[PDB]
Structures are given as structure tokens and as C-alpha cells.
Amino acid sequence: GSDLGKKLLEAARAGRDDEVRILMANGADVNAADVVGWTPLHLAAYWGHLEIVEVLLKNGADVNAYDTLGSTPLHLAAHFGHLEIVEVLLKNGADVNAKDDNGITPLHLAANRGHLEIVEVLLKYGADVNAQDKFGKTAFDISINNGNEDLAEILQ
Amino acid sequence: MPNFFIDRPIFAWVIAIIIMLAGGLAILKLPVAQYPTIAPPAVTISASYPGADAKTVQDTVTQVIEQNMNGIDNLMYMSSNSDSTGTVQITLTFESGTDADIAQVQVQNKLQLAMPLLPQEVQQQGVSVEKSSSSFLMVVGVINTDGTMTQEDISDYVAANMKDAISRTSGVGDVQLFGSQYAMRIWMNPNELNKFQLTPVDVITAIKAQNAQVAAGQLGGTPPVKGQQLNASIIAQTRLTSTEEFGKILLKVNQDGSRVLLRDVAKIELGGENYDIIAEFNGQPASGLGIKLATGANALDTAAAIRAELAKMEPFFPSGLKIVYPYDTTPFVKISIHEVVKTLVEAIILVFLVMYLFLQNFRATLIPTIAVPVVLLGTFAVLAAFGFSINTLTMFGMVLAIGLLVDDAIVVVENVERVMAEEGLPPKEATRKSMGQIQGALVGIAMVLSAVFVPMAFFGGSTGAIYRQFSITIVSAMALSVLVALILTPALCATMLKPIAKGDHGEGKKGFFGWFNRMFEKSTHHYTDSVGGILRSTGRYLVLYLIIVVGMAYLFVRLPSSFLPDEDQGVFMTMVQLPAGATQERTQKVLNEVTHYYLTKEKNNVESVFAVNGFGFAGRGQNTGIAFVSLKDWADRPGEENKVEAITMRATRAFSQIKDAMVFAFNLPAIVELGTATGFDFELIDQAGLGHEKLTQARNQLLAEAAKHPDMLTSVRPNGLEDTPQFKIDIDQEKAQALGVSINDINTTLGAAWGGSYVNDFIDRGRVKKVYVMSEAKYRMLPDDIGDWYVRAADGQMVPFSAFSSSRWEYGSPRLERYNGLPSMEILGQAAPGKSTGEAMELMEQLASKLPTGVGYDWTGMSYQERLSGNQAPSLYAISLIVVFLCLAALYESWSIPFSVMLVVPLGVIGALLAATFRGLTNDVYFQVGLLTTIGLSAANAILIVEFAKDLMDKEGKGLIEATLDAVRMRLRPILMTSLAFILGVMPLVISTGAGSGAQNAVGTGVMGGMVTATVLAIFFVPVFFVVVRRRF
Amino acid sequence: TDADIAQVQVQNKLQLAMPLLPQEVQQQGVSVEKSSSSFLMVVGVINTDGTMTQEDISDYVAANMKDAISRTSGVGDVQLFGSQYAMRIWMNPNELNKFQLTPVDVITAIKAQNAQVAAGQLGGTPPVKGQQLNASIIAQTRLT
Amino acid sequence: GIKLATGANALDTAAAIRAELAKMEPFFPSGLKIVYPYDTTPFVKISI
Amino acid sequence: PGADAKTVQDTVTQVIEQNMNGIDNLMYMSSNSDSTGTVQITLTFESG
Amino acid sequence: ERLSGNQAPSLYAISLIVVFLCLAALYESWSIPFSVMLVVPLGVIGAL
Ligand SMILES: CCCCCCCCCCCCO[C@@H]1O[C@H](CO)[C@@H](O[C@H]2O[C@H](CO)[C@@H](O)[C@H](O)[C@H]2O)[C@H](O)[C@H]1O
Ligand SMILES: CN(C)c1ccc(O)c2c1C[C@H]1C[C@H]3[C@H](N(C)C)C(O)=C(C(N)=O)C(=O)[C@@]3(O)C(O)=C1C2=O
């Protein structure tokens, strides 16, 4: 960890675009991670800060960085319904099929929260409709258990 | 009345003796404390939910309690925190004047009825309902110096062998243990458990069965068969008493017949109930007692009684155990009493000297020396009767009143002496004539002072409670003062003064007094010449007066306001705040630095550092701590450089370097409620369904906007905690059902191991104590540890936690706040320099009006007590103004002549402001009360000038100017005498350094500035006021 | 009679009976009040756009207005003319029998799966030496 | 339906109730409105 | 119920008594703990 | 009983002092008062 890295984790989390700008100009480590393995990109993904997501990617952020439980920024953005950030991440080479330690994918997460547009994007980018988590569940299993009919229909 | 007692000096003495006995008695029995109760009554509800996260606490405890806080009288507002240490505190604040006992029983009773809705483990811990207090009498530290005891060892020793005796000590109202009594600690090993197909559930079950009190009955109990010879109680199973016995608890018998005991799956030891606080006193393990003074108790007696009890425990201490006193307000309070007694005594001595300098005979000298103590004693008796205590405020109240008391004594005696020298009348006849001249004015003065100070007793809230202490003290003193002036001092004059030959002004005397008299007689003529010239040219003086009034307003508007002066109380505080998520060990490192600094760099100033790791003020947790610093006695800290303010400043600069931590030192506030600062206290509120995240966004929005007005708002900040990473674990219901693993087994296995669980009680050397099970540390540190915990399925197979769970990182709140039952976030800030808190509050409301739909706000605390009892000041001094005018009108039998007295007000205020401004002080409580007494005394001087003038015109047919010059000639000496004695007397206060000098300066500076300009200006301006007012009508 | 003391004396005796009462009675909350028997006023609430039913308004009132009114000094008792919302589970005996289940299973499942668990902390005190992580463990939370 | 606590002042309590309702109104859902169907308070104030 | 005198004293009487501090006007306190498990604690206050 | 006995001397002393002062005040004398107070043992001995 570094001084400016800490400041960047905080600014990305807070969505302070201008500070991120300045920090990017000064070489603040885009690959800094806190104790649970979240990078500034994780943070911006989680809290829905799109412009910072884009800035961070222009500045060499690891789009497929994973935390200590194997989750990527795409997991976060997909889970919390940030559609534009999901799109940007995918445009920049996010692994649409990344499995966290639980065998959970971005598609599983988006299904579970019923984010329909995000599910369509992930499918559009090759999300594996048949991927099973550690319990043998698919996005489709999740949709019928949740009783989400629109979602179930999308997943055939 | 004066006539009555001039003929009845013995009756007058009897009244005086009665007053003295009452006051003497009052002095013996009066309670003593640093401060009286000031803050509105509050009741706190505290609950503990072992291993609970903030949201769990809030949603299974806090909301439920809050929803039952109905039908309670005189509630102002209610607030709460729920946090991830598993703690909730709900605070209910009541209207000033509410009976705190009733408030508290109504709260406790509504709680009792909500208990059945709380979780079992919360009912088990209990929920405490208490009266709130932030002030301690003292903190007794208890340390072990030979490395043989842990803080847990010490806390239990204190709990078992010291606390109860201190609680039973005379005058103590409450004692808090800084730690806990022992708990029986069962630290489980998941590998051992799984080895024998056991879980924490089996451990809890076995403990509940083998550590229990079992009822049996009696042999030969009633109804018996007749002829029974024996009746005896049956004793069956009773609780375990020792770690050995807990160790031998039987968990399982294997097929080979071998036995699994609790000690085979766990480490067993006496330990603490909690491990969140690590306390050290100069690096050594520490516990302690926080002691509060009981209602009506005498602080000094109690502190003394506490020390005597401790001393008689000392012989039985184990080796290395030592008592330490890091905080004790008593020595400071002793100083204040000695200083106030010193001030009053030398005031009396100064009056003595001034009386002899001018009057030059010891008999006149003795009269004030008797009258003033009689007034003081009687005032104590009245205060006592009112239920007041001897405290900082009431003591300084009497100091602020000294000028007023002395003036009544000097005025009565000086006038008799003048009349004797000017007329040759014998002492008795002179005294009658003299009281005939000042009688009505003395009463008028008492009424006017009453009209000035009494309205000040009617301010609301906390600042009102403070003002009331000065108001009632000073008004009582004035009441006694005029009674003694109409009763005792005339009697004393008529019977103790020697005659003076007509025309004898002592100018024939030899030596110094001979030279003083001719000097002062000439000065009087010079003085009256000037007044004569001034009165030939009053136009320019009206201009000068307006210039003073304008300047008074100018200085008044720029003088920053405050509440009470900081003091060097021999102690101060250091805040240690690490980033969110920082562990206890990291926080300890920084406290170690802080401590090493003070014991090195401040070696000559610091006695001790009491380091409390894990404790904060606005949120506990592993990442926060405090270092409480105790200094050597003021006597070993000569100079401003070795006083608290300087030590603190150096500390904070030194710690500004410290790496990843905010570390700063600060002095303690005089009270602590009252919030000092400029300070406003704002609550942002979720009024709709919004939720924590949307409330946070709205808060951030507000804070960003506030920051754009540095001109108006400064340091606008949240008072709470930011969200932090938390570990979310999902139990898969289906997989658990498929494996035959019950959810209950899963959840208690998790909670017991990782959170700890209060099982039941045991008896440790005759004292009942708790039994806790929890994982040994190394098995509950990290996510990978989760999978080492196994649960037994119905079919007997051991199933690892990883088989039926999944986990992810997320963010959540470590501390959830609510206000009046709704989600909330407290924001602190202050008005920017030059700006009024009222202005700052208005902006905050404006910014608050533009926040997202559903977001509301409120004012609480010090700000709640501005939105009301501040819109109240102007109408009180309007009432004061009107009543003062009405008294003067009655005194002078004129609607217009009163103005010539009231015009004096700015003359003293200008000097007070000039002096406070110059010395860099503030417009605080002592300043303000001082303004009132300075105004009061100058008004009394003016009243007697106008009175003399007006009577010369009415009774001797003299002209306006002729009467004014004669009036002002007669009043010059008594006016100078009082001012001289007073100004000299309040001078030590102005220059004072060291303990209590903050208060002493605030009292002295304003009074001395004001009395100088009031005296010097009014002896020239009052003649002008009277002449111009009389001409105009 | 001092109504404060009367209420205190009544409740002191009530808490002696409380433990002898059925658990379902204690959980509904028994209350002790000191008020007049007649209504001071009735505060009515309506929706002039007709966008809320009787049930909706009643829940709105119970959930956003009634508690603060109930805490207001001088308010002795407050009656809601309606009912706060609850999670209503309307059981079907035919389907219960079809799956060989009863209301007892339904009740047990609800207690098991609508639970708010205390689960402790990673890196919680007392910790091992050199611990770097401290975080709350969040398990089951109440359904919503 | 609000009942007055034993001994409490009816007019003061009604005032405090209105003050409290005033704090709530700005956050009502659209269409929600308070009406005043039954009040024993006005008559006291008016008859006096 | 069922507790002996010493057990009820250690688990009940002493627990209550050590919380009976800082009560106004308390003159003295007496208690007894007995073999039927019953505890009685009497607190006597100054005459006024 | 202990309290009763302990405060009695104080009671007598303050009572005698008050009686003396009232006399002094009423008869504008210290001598008249001292003259009558000397009577007190004359009555007390009979009571005893
Ligand atoms: C105890 C405090 C003692 C402090 C003493 C320090 C000195 C204070 C001086 C007070 C001011 C008195 O100043 C007084 O002014 C008036 C004018 O206004 C002068 O009066 C003179 O000038 C005026 C105006 O030209 C003429 O009308 C007047 O006939 C003439 O005698 C007085 O001669 C002077 O004595
Ligand atoms: C905050 N304070 C003055 C101190 C100072 C030094 C200390 O050494 C301690 C405290 C707080 C007290 C509170 C007590 C409390 N109780 C009176 C037993 C308590 O409920 C808790 C708790 N975490 O639940 C403690 O931390 C606690 O056990 C504790 O360990 C403390 C402690 O060790």
C-alpha cells in the first residue's frame, strides 16, 4: 500500500471525480487494494461512480481484479444494478463469466436481484447461461425460485 | 426603621446575631460541588447483544424499545445509537424541571413492558435504565506494578473487594467499574470438537445441565405423617465454582468407554466479560472506579471519605497492587474556596484601609467590618434555604456582588460623617438626619438591583440554570445588604461614632492625614469647578455620550461570545483515531507512541498517561482510543509554557506527524454539556422510506453544500461513523435441509464460536458470575477459518460450514443512529468567525430545504435550546428596563427624572468591553454578570447624586445648577471610596494565573474595566444627565 | 391522587402477574395507561387523490405518525382507527395436507428463515497477534 | 383517537399535537391530507 | 424456590444490596435470606 | 432513642440562647435578660 493509493481508494469510493483526476495525474496506484482486496475500480463499481470507473480504466486499472473472495468489479456492478458501469467494464475486457470463490457469476448475481437489462447485456457479451455455482444453481434456477417470470422467460 | 433601631441598638444586634448564627449554621451544612446540575434531565437505556452487528441491534432491539416509549411525561426528544460492538444506547431528554426519578421510572416501566419482545440473549444480558450524568467526582485507578496481574485480574479484584465498600461510602452516589468481574471463559477448539463429533451446541447443553441450581424439597415437609421427628431441607445440585470443575464437565462417552471432557475441546480460564477495552496506566495493566457525588453531598467530605476507605483496604492488597488518582476535582474545588474566601477577606481589609484613609478614625472603620460579614452570612443562610450549594458559580456570584455590598456599608457611614462635619450634629442626631437623606434611595437601589437581576433567573434551559445561580445569589445578597443598612449600620453609627466639630475637615491635622485632607478638599473644589464648566457647555458632552454609545455598540458586536473559560484542571485528553477497519493491535501501537511522548517530552509536567484502547466518544471499536493525561501539581508547573493549553498545543503539533492516524490533545470543557464552541447540533432525518444509503447520500450532499460557505459555516462534519467492509455469509437452506443439518445448530455454532455466547452463571468465591463460550482466537480470525467449523447432521455426519454456505464482501454501517424514532444522522458544525450561531443555523436550514424528497431535519441539544430559549432574552431585559424605570419614578415621584439615572448604563459597559477586548477575552457568562453588577453599582452612585440634587431643589429651594453642584460635591467622596476599595479588591483576580484563573480573569477584567470608566465618567456625566433631563421637561 | 404514583403502583403489581400470563399475551404487549376515558380529539387522515386505500392510509398513519403522537407529553392514549400492516401468511389447508405439512411446520420455517442472527466478527477481540482484518460477520437478516 | 393524560392541560396538549403533525405533513405521499373531524378543544378556547 | 439460605444470599440478596447505593435519605438497610429461598430487604429512610 | 439523647443538649442550648436574645430585643437590654435567665436552674432542679 501507498499514501496516494489510500487517497485514491477513498476518492473512488466517495465519487470525488476531480480528486481522482488530480490523483491520476500524480500516478496514484490504480492497483492499490484495501485489506479485503478491493481496488479503486471495485469501489467505484460498487458505489456506482461511472465517470471514475471510466477514468480508472483509461489509467490502466485491472478490469478483472478480484478480491479475497474472488469477486470482480463486474460482480459488484452487476449485483447492484449499475447498467452503464456493467457496459463499460465489458467493453474493456471484463471476464463476463468470472467465478468468485462460491462459483457465483455476474449473471447469477444480476438474476438474483432481478436486473433484467443487465442480464441481457451479460448474455449479449457471452455470459454462460448454464454456469452452476457451488450449489449447482443456474441463473435460471434463481429466477424461478425468486418467482421472477420475466427473467425466467429471458433465460429461456 | 432606621429611626427605630437607632434607639434600639441591642435589638439591632440581636437581629444581626440571629442572621450570623443562621449563616454560620448554613456554612457548616451547605453542600459543596464544583458545579450545580445544569443540563436537563436525561435517561439512558443501554443494552448489549453479544456478537451482534449494528443492523441486528437496531432491528431486533432498538426499534422495539423505541416503539414502546409512549405515554411518558415531559419528553423533549429521544435519540439512539446502535452499533457493531453489539451495543445500543437510547437517550431520552426531558423538559428542564422534570423530576428525574419520575422520568426514569416511567421510562423503566415502559421498557419492562417491551422486554418480552426483545431477543432472549438480550433479555439475558439485561437492559439498564439510568439517570444520565457526564461528571465524575473522581476516578480511582488501580494498577499492578509487579507484572503479576492482568487488567482482568485487577478488575475482578476491584469488583470483589473494593467497589461495594466505595459505593457504601458517605456521599458517593454511584460507582462504575472500568472493566468487569471475572467470567468463566470457555475457549473452544473446532478441531477438537470435530474430532469427537461435537459442536458448540453440545458444549452449551452440557454446561447448562452440569452447572445448575436444582430444587429438591424437604424431609418431613408439611403436610407430614404425624409422629414425624425430623424436618430437614434437601440440597441437590448447586452451581460449579471453579475452572477445574468446568474442565471436568462430561461431553461424551466413546464406544471404548473413554471420556470426552470439556477441557479436551477447550481452554478454560477466569477472564473478562469483554475484551474490547485495553487499559494501561503508564504502560501497566489497569482498572479503576469512576465515582460520582451523591445528590446534596459535600464533595470535599466525600473525596476524603473515599480516600479513608481505600487506605483501610491497602493492607489486604495483593503484591504490586496500587491505588492511583488520575482524576480528582476536589483539589481544584479546594483552591476555588480558598481563593474566594481570600478575595472576600481582603476586600473587607481594603474597605478597612480606604475607610481609615478618608475617615481617619477606627470607629467608622469598624462598622463596615461588621456589616459586611453579617450580610455575607445571611446570604449563605438564604442560599441554603433556597437549596443552593457552594459551587463555582455561586461563589463567584458573591465576588461579583462585593462592590454592591461594600457600597451600602460605606454610603451609610460616610454620610453620617459628612453631616457631622458639615453641621456639628451629635452622632445620634446626625445618624437620624443622615438616614433621612438616604433611606428611600437605599430602598430604591435595592428595588432597581432586583429589577436588573431577577429577570435573569427566567432564562430557560441550561444557560438559564447557570444564570439563575448568579441571579438568586446576588439578589439575596442585595436584600440582606439593604436590611442591614436600614437596621444594623444606623444603630452602629449612632452608638459607635465620635462627634465631629462643625467645619472640622481635618485640614489642621499634621503629617500625612493632614496633607491628604487639604489635598482632597482642594481636589473637590477643582472637581466642582470642572463640573461647573461642563454644565456651562453641555452640548459637547451629549456628543461625547453618543460617541461612547456608538463605540459601545461597535465593541459589543465584535466581542466573540463563549460560555465558560477553560481551566488548567491538572488533566487533559488525547484522541486517537485510526482509519476504519484498523485492528486493536494497530491502535495500541499509536497509544504506545502517545504515552512515550508524554513521559519523555513532557517529563517535567506529566504525572501519568491513562491509555484506553478501544474507547471513543462518538463510536467505539478497535480503531479508536483515548489517552487521559494527568499533570503534576500546578506548583511544579511554573509559567504559561507548562500549563495545559501550551502542553496541549505542543502535543497536537507533535502528533500531527503520526503516520496513519488522527491524534490530538485538548483541554476539558468547564461543564461538557452546553457543547461550548459556537456549535450547532443538527439532525438529518429519514422521513419516508428512504433507508441508510439514501440518507448517507443526502448527508453528503448537505456537507458538500455547507463546505461552499466558509464565510458562514466551518467544520460541518458527521458525528458518527462511515460504512465499512463487512463479511456477508449466506446459509443455503436447501443444502442444509438436504444434509439434515438444522438451521438452529448452524446459527448457534456460528454465533457461539465467532461472537461468544453467555451460557449461564457460576459462583466464584461467593459471588455470582457469567459463563461464556467462544472460539479460541486463532480459529475465528479469517474467512478461511469459517470452514474449520463443523456441525453434526441428523445422521451423525460432521458437515463443514463451507458445505452449506457462501460469502461475499459488502459495505454496511458499524453504527446506526436514530432521532425521535426515525433513522438519522447527526451533523456538528459552528458559525464562522464573526457570524452568529443563529445565522449559521438559518443557512443550514436553507441548505436542508434543497435535499432529496423525504429528507427532513431537526435541531437537538445546545441548538434545541437556542431555537426556543434565546428568543426570550430581549423581552426579559425589556421587563428589566421597564421595572427599573417604574421604581425610579416612584423613588423620585417623577416620570422624567429616572432617565437621568438610566443614562449611566453605557458608561460602565464601555470600560468592560474595552478591557475584555484589550485582554483578548470573550463575552461569556462571567463577563455578562459583571456588566450587570457594574451597571448596578454605577446606577446606585447616580441614584444618590440625583436624589441629593432633587431634594436640594425641592426642600431648600436651590437652583438646578446650584443643587447639582452641591449634590455632586457631597457624593464625590463616597463614590471614590467604594470604587477604590472595589477596584483594588478585584485586581488580584485580573492578574491571577494558575488554578481557576480562567474564571478569575473573566470576573476581574470586565468588572475592573467597567468600574474605572463608570466612576471616572459618571462623576462628570451624571450632573450633565440630570441637568439636561430637567431642562427638557 | 398523584396519577404518576398511581401508575407506578399499578405497574409494580402488574409485573408480578406478568410472568404468569400466556406468552402470546406478553408478546402483544400489555399496557398501563393514565388517561381520561373520553377522546380529546380525533385526527383523521384521507387521500384526496383516491390513490390510497383505507388499509394503506391506516398503515401510513401507524408507521409514520402514531409513534410521535403517542410520545407527545399530555397524550395519555392513542387509538388507531385501522391497523398497521403485518406480513400476512394466509394458509391453505388443502395444500398443507397435499405436502403433509401443518401450520406448525409453517411457523417453524418462518422462525428459522426470517431470522436476524448475531454472528460476531472476523478479527474480533480478543484477537491473535498481528491480526490485520476486522469486520462484522453478517448472516441472516429479517425478510422485507 | 387521542385521549388526554390525567391532569394534563387540554389546550396545551392539542397545540403540541398540531405542532407535531405539522412536522409530518411536508413528507406525506401525494394526496394524503389531515382532516379534523372531532375536537373538543376549539369550544374551550372560543367559549373563554 | 428450592435455594438454600447461602445460595439465595450470593445469587440474590448481595446482588440487590450492592445496587442499593446512592439512594436519597437512606438511614439503614437490613436483609435476611432463608432456607425457603426467600429474600427480604428493608430500606429505612430519614424521618422527613 | 440514641438520636433523641444525642441531640438533646443542642436543643437546650439553642433554646436558651434564643430565649435570651428575644428578651434582649424585647427589653432593649442585656441585663434584664441575664437577670431572668438565671432563674432557669430554679425550675430545672424541681423537674429533675
Ligand atoms: C476620580 C477621577 C479623576 C479624573 C480626573 C482627570 C481629569 C478629568 C477632566 C474632566 C473634564 C473636565 O473638563 C472641563 O471642561 C470644561 C468645558 O467642557 C471646562 O470649562 C471651560 O470651557 C468651557 C467650554 O469652552 C467653558 O464654557 C467654561 O466656562 C470654561 O471654564 C472646564 O474648565 C474643564 O474642567
Ligand atoms: C470507558 N471507560 C472509562 C473504561 C476505561 C477503562 C476500562 O478498562 C474500561 C472502561 C469501560 C468499561 C465498561 C464495561 C461494561 N460493564 C460495566 C461490565 C461493559 O458492558 C462492556 C461491554 N463491552 O459490553 C465493557 O467493555 C466493560 O466490561 C469494560 O471492559 C470496561 C473497561 O475495561
Residue numbers in the entry:
A (entry chain D): 11 to 166
B (entry chain B): 1 to 1033
C (entry chain A): 98 to 241
D (entry chain A): 290 to 337
E (entry chain C): 50 to 97
F (entry chain C): 866 to 913
Verbatim from the authors:
The AcrA-AcrB-TolC complex is a secondary active antiport system in Escherichia coli, powered by the electrochemical proton gradient across the inner membrane of this Gram-negative bacterium. Its biological function is to capture cytotoxic compounds from either the periplasmic space or the inner membrane, and to expel them across the outer membrane, into the extracellular medium. AcrB is the inner-membrane component of the system, and is responsible for both substrate recognition and energy transduction. The asymmetric trimer structures indicate that this domain also cycles between three distinct conformations, and point to several ionizable residues in its core (D407, D408, K940 and R971) that might function as a proton-relay network.
To further assess the proposed proton-relay mechanism and its influence on the conformation of the TM domain, we solved the atomic structures of four AcrB variants, namely K940A, R971A, D407N and D408N, all of which abolish the drug-efflux activity of AcrB. Electron-density maps for these variants could be resolved at resolutions ranging from 2.0 to 2.3 Å, which are sufficient to discern the precise configuration of side-chains and structural waters inside the TM domain. In all cases, the crystal structures represent an asymmetric configuration of the AcrB trimer. None of the substitutions studied caused significant changes in the internal structure of the R1 and R2 repeats, compared to the wildtype L, T and O states. The relative orientation of these two repeats is also unchanged in the K940A and D408N mutants, as is the side-chain configuration of the proton-relay network, aside from the mutations. That is, these two substitutions appear to perturb the conformational cycle of the transporter by altering the energetic balance between the L, T and O states, rather than by precluding the protomers from adopting native-like conformations in each of these states. Indeed, electrostatic calculations analogous to those carried out for the wildtype protein show that in the K940A structure, D408 is constitutively neutralized throughout the cycle. D407, which is more proximal to R971, is deprotonated in the L and T states and protonated in the O state, as in the wildtype. Similarly for the D408N variant, D407 is predicted to become protonated only in the O state, while the substituted N408 is evidently neutral throughout the cycle (K940 and R971 are protonated in all states in both mutants). These results imply that the ionic interactions across the R1-R2 interface that stabilize the L and T states are weakened in the mutants. By contrast, the O state is probably less affected (K940A) or not at all (D408N), since the repeats become disengaged in this state.
